[PDB]
């Protein structure tokens, strides 16, 4: 089994840092903002050996045909914002709309990810507003830190479980 994950979210939210923490258990600071890469690794998911496929999108130059292609190919989405940037939270609705427009399936595996949880002292987005949005969207909200590893494995594994459940029907 291969579970195809797409990272989405505004520039600078931590998509790359999250991906590299998951992949190689390292905190990578200031990874090239406009650089995209794909990653693949074998994991044991609830006693079963599977592969995860992660596309860490850049997004600054992903025009209609490019983004539509990878939204269609993607099976699950980590929608990341930074808890320190309200604008990045506001933007999450846009990524989700565009994902929903191409997938025409509201039941798409999707997690809302509030990253940079170590930066509580600079928080701009309340837990209340994010949890409320997650409920409205019928998805889970998880707060992460690629710096401290907080909930990083959790979001990737939880999304995989959702992709797996969706594949089970049928």
């Amino acid at each position: 089994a291969l579970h195809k994950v797409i990272m989405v979210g505004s520039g600078g939210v931590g998509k790359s840092a999250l991906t590299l923490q998951f992949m190689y258990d390292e905190f990578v600071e200031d990874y090239e903002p406009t650089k995209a890469d794909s990653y693949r690794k074998k994991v044991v998911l609830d006693g079963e050996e599977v592969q995860i496929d992660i596309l860490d999108t850049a997004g600054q130059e992903d025009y209609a045909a490019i983004r539509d292609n990878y939204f269609r190919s993607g099976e699950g989405f980590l929608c990341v914002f930074s808890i320190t940037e309200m604008e990045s939270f506001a933007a999450t609705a846009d990524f989700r709309e565009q994902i929903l427009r191409v997938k025409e399936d509201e039941n798409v595996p999707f997690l809302l990810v509030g990253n940079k949880s170590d930066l509580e002292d600079k928080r701009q987005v309340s837990v209340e507003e994010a949890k409320n949005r997650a409920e409205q969207w019928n998805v889970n909200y998880v707060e992460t830190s690629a710096k401290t590893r907080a909930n990083v494995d959790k979001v990737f594994f939880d999304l995989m479980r959702e992709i797996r459940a969706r594949k089970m029907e049928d």
Binding site: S10, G11, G59, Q60, D62, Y63, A64, R67, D94, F95
Partner: protein, 207 residues
């Protein structure tokens, strides 16, 4: 040395001479016309997303693609000075209602803070950068004036002949551009911050 136009008719002559060679398509011109009507909205979304466009709706993302690619046809033939007017929020949210003294002069504390924040540093702009060939348009009265030093061969388009606001002598620069702030001073007026910056280039370079 960077050309700096001292006369509107000369600037227009130079601009028209560049424009004549662009050979823009119908859809490219339409995207540009629409930009001149909607810049702050398009640039607002680019800034909100730090340049990421994959959440943009169809109409907006196609406009961005057309704008981006039109710069393959629009380059400056020589080193040129471009002028830009900005409002206080350009310096940051903390400057928005904070830049000006009650008598209309730039506050010296605000200025010193801005100088520490930006001087001798690179700055990245997520939006397209609207500028003018001269400093006599309606934007010349804004509290922040930027003089951009734009090198020969750089992506830069004279779009006045198709702008919804002819007379602005508009030179558009690509989005996602970095420039280095070389100098920051107060006008003799004390009413404006004058910034001199060297344009470095854009990250958006489609085939």
């Amino acid at each position: 040395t960077y050309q700096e136009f001292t006369n509107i008719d000369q600037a227009k002559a130079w601009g028209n001479a560049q424009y004549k060679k662009y050979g823009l398509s119908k859809s490219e011109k339409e995207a540009i016309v629409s930009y001149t009507k909607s810049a702050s909205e398009i640039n607002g979304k680019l800034r909100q997303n730090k340049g990421v466009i994959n959440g943009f709706p169809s109409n907006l993302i196609k406009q961005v693609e057309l704008l981006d690619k039109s710069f393959n046809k629009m380059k400056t033939p020589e080193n040129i000075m471009l002028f830009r007017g900005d409002d206080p929020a350009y310096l940051g949210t903390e400057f928005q209602n904070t830049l000006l003294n009650s008598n209309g002069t730039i506050n010296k504390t605000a200025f010193e803070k801005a100088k520490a924040k930006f001087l001798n540093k690179d700055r990245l702009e997520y939006g397209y950068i609207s500028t003018s060939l001269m400093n006599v348009s309606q934007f010349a009265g804004r509290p922040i004036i930027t003089k951009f030093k734009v090198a020969k061969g750089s992506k830069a388009g004279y779009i006045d002949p198709i702008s919804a606001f002819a007379g602005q002598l508009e030179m558009l620069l690509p989005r996602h551009s970095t420039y280095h702030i070389d100098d920051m001073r107060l006008s003799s007026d004390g009413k404006q911050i004058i910034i001199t910056a060297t344009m470095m280039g854009t990250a958006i370079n489609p085939k």
